[PDB]
């Protein structure tokens, strides 16, 4: 069976990503990372909520997927599949190791002790720090209550302490809502699907004319 999370909770070793040196790493449990109305236009979901961590620990792929499913079910049932866009902002890339030992009577005969104790891959965990964003979501201003309740329900699936906050930014973009609105009215921000691109000044006036800013 899987070892308790307390064994690999805290960050102690250097990063151990899957590479040519570490082979035979089992697939991580969490595969999906963007749920809800992911293909939404930038303006569909102006309100944004973050779920930050207050601990420097390891978030297992199992825990990440558990929180994902919990929040996704809550929002699908309370607000519809096409009313939100949830983004898991943390990917499990750190590999933990286990030094398996036999646990039957007489195991000491075949046990190797501490000689050559380098472990084998066990699972994929995501290294987290204080202030790191675990979950993010963009929704309509009339669904912030559901967003906060969903993040509340999900945080109990993670170890340690998490804090749910609402961001001043326009959805997942990098501009506060007021500046985003002003720049979009001006013509400096071009739709980039979920996000937007800044249209800088410099360059040939031939492309300038296509959108005079």
């Amino acid at each position: 069976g899987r070892r308790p999370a307390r064994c690999y909770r805290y960050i102690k070793n250097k990063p151990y990503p899957k590479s040519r040196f570490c082979r035979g790493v089992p697939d991580a449990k969490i595969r999906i990372f963007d749920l809800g109305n992911k293909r939404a236009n930038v303006d569909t979901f102006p309100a944004c909520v973050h779920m930050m961590s207050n601990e420097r620990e390891h978030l297992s792929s199992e825990a990440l997927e558990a929180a994902r499913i919990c929040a996704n079910k809550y929002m699908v049932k309370n607000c519809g599949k096409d009313g939100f866009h949830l983004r898991v902002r943390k990917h499990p890339f750190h590999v933990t190791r286990i030094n398996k030992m036999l646990s039957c009577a007489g195991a000491d005969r075949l046990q190797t002790g501490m000689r050559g104790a380098y472990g084998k891959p066990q699972g994929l965990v995501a290294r987290v720090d204080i202030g790191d964003i675990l979950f993010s979501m963009r929704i309509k201003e009339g669904n912030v209550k559901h967003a906060i309740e969903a993040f509340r329900r999900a945080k109990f699936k993670f170890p340690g302490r998490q804090i749910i906050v609402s961001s001043r930014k326009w959805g997942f973009t990098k501009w506060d809502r007021e500046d985003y609105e002003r720049m979009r009215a001006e013509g400096r921000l071009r739709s980039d699907g979920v996000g937007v691109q800044l249209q800088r000044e410099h360059g040939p006036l031939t492309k300038w004319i296509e959108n005079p800013i």
């Binding site: 006036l205 300038w208 004319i209 005079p212």
Partner: protein, 289 residues
Amino acid sequence: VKVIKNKAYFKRYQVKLRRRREGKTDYYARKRLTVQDKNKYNTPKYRLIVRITNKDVVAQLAYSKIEGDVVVASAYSHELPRYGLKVGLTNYAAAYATGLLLARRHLKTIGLDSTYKGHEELTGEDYNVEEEGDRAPFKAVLDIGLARTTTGSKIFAVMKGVADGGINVPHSESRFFGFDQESKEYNAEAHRDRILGKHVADYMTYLKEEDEDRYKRQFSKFLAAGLNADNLVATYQKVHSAIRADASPAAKKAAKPSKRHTAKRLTYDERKQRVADKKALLLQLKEQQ
């Protein structure tokens, strides 16, 4: 198709040295040609640069420094009309004459011409200036640049001219004209004839016999200068004699006033004004289209 010369390519690009980009200096050979042994300290190492343009032959003497080479002497084929020749300033005879002029000129300048006269009788036999008295002969190492080293090349013609003038240029007769690569034999008579331009006169006669029109088309300005296939050898001999008689550089003229012939770079305000004008014009066209 994926774009190859993109932002990352230009970010990572490293430009070769200026002269390698210009395809004008071979640095691998330059390092070996110009670098002096560190236990000789700041003693100059002298290099005889030979170059052939489409219409001229350049022979120079130089030595290297941290801030650029120092050319100490020079001689050009276009400077031969003072010693005679008006045409054929690129052939073997002109190259040899330019080399001889350079050698005599620099020996005069450094005050060794009287001590070292070199070979004053054109015979085509290999000649190495032999040390006389205490002062050893001036020494220089040949620099051909990017020219191919073939037997009978005009670069080696210039080198032979300098060596005959009396500058110690280390060399072998292998790449002189008249040296047979197969039998490894040297024909001093053939080399002398090539130096004196007998090949040019032979071509003149051959074309004159073959076709008059082709002969004129080939030797137009030779005839205008009055050089025919029975006078060229004597002309080259006279040129050699005049070069050996006098080799001081020609005097310099006065500096004429100069006026701008090219456009001057716009200022910051001018560039911004042009930007504004183009913006206004483009907006006008967009509105009217």
